[PDB]
Design a protein around this nucleic acid. Structure first.
Ligand SMILES: [Zn+2]
Ligand SMILES: [Zn+2]
Ligand SMILES: [Zn+2]
Ligand SMILES: [Zn+2]
Lengths: 73, 77
DNA sequence: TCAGAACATGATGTTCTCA
DNA sequence: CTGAGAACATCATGTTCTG
């Protein structure tokens, strides 16, 4: 489906998996970024176009479960 | 030290009744901010999200419910 | 075809008015 | 010594523009 991460309209395979424009950046900034993403549920959040801004911990955990690589070095 | 009573909404050390109940400076502006502008938030979970000082940004759909449950209101005239 | 500058914003806290 | 509302100054995600 479009964005095997947020179900929004994907722009094309990004970092290895089909994603929207947003998802691209999120996963770039998440990875190269000092963070402490903490979920406020049970690590099972729904993630769509709208519901995505909500939980970063799960969304990133999604930009990890479904391939999405930065690739070594 | 520095524990001046937890926000009835989130948990952060609040500061004086705001819009009806003990809330932080954060929650104060949120509840004023959540009512005026168009919002219609969407909870990304099972409508029971923790709203402590950290995760309070995560789900404003629940924090609002928390405000509406702590009886927050603009009072009126 | 896809990267990431880069320009959009958006959302949020913490002051600092004031009465 | 209140308890509100600017308006700051801060982040966080989204869009277009660039190779
Ligand atoms: Zn996406
Ligand atoms: Zn989550
Ligand atoms: Zn609070
Ligand atoms: Zn929620």
């Amino acid at each position: 489906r479009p964005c095997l991460v947020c179900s929004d309209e994907a722009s094309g395979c990004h970092y290895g998996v089909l994603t929207c424009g947003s998802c691209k950046v999120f996963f770039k900034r998440a990875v190269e970024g000092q963070h402490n993403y903490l979920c406020a549920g049970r690590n099972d959040c729904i993630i769509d176009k709208i519901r995505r801004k909500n939980c970063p911990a799960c969304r990133y955990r999604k930009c990890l479960q479904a391939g999405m690589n930065l690739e070594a070095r």
